[model samples]
Target: CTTGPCCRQCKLKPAGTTCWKTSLTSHYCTGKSCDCPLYPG
Candidate 1:
């Protein structure tokens, strides 16, 4: 999982990263936090 495409749970993502949406009101970024894939799977 590390060093691949997935991001750390507590890690911060890059600026303007297009994250995935799991819920209707929740985004994958989670306020700049990293919890989604860094690239397309």
Candidate 2:
């Protein structure tokens, strides 16, 4: 139903920030909904 990382939950992955539980990269993927940071940056 999707390609590459997708929405699931929030967790730490390859990215330097916390993204969707399924995220596999810092950038280039699905919606920004998966994009999140731990603190102000």
Candidate 3:
């Protein structure tokens, strides 16, 4: 297998990103909704 990094399925973060859930470089919850927190993910 290939457990590359801690990926809880992340990478939509691009609008004031500040991450830390064992932040080894991945993203979520950057808190930049053009409308709101639409979690279809």
Candidate 4:
């Protein structure tokens, strides 16, 4: 997966974003209040 904000559907977790959901191929927060990391400029 690319480096950026991605909306993923985690089965175990709730309907939101989380660093824990940030897998090796998926690195991004799908949560509205989640201040996840951003890619380079």
Residues 1-41 of candidate 3 have per-residue lDDT tens digits of 11222122233444323333223433324433222221332
Count the clashes in each prediction: 0, 0, 0, 1
Off by over 4 Å in 3: 1-9, 20-41
What lDDT score is found at residue 37 in candidate 4? 46
Number of residue pairs clashing in candidate 4, backbone atoms closer than 3 angstroms, sequence gap of 3 or more or interchain:
1
**For model 1, how does the per-residue alpha-carbon lDDT over 5-38 read when each residue is reduced to its tens digit?**
3334432343333465433322335334455544
TM-score of every prediction relative to native: 0.25, 0.15, 0.14, 0.24
lDDT of 3 at 39: 33
lDDT over C-alpha atoms for residue 16 of model 1? 31
Which structure among the candidates has the greatest lDDT? 1
Q: What is the lDDT for 23 in model 2?
A: 35
Report how far residue 6 has shifted in candidate 1, in Å: 5.7
For model 4, residues 1-41, the per-residue Cα lDDT tens digits are: 22333333222223334554444333345534444442222
Best TM-score among the predictions, by candidate number: 1
In candidate 2, list every pair of residues with a backbone clash.
none
Error of 4 at 11 (Å): 19
Ten contiguous residues minimizing lDDT sum, candidate 2: 3-12
For residue 15, give model 2's deviation from the true position in Å: 1.5
Ranking by lDDT: 1, 4, 2, 3
User: Model 2, stretches more than 4 Å misplaced?
Assistant: 1-9, 16-41
lDDT of 2 by residue, 1-41 (tens): 23333323332333442333333343222343453432222
Candidate 4 wrongly placed segments (more than 4 Å)? 1-16, 20-27, 38-41
Sum up the clashes in candidate 3: 0
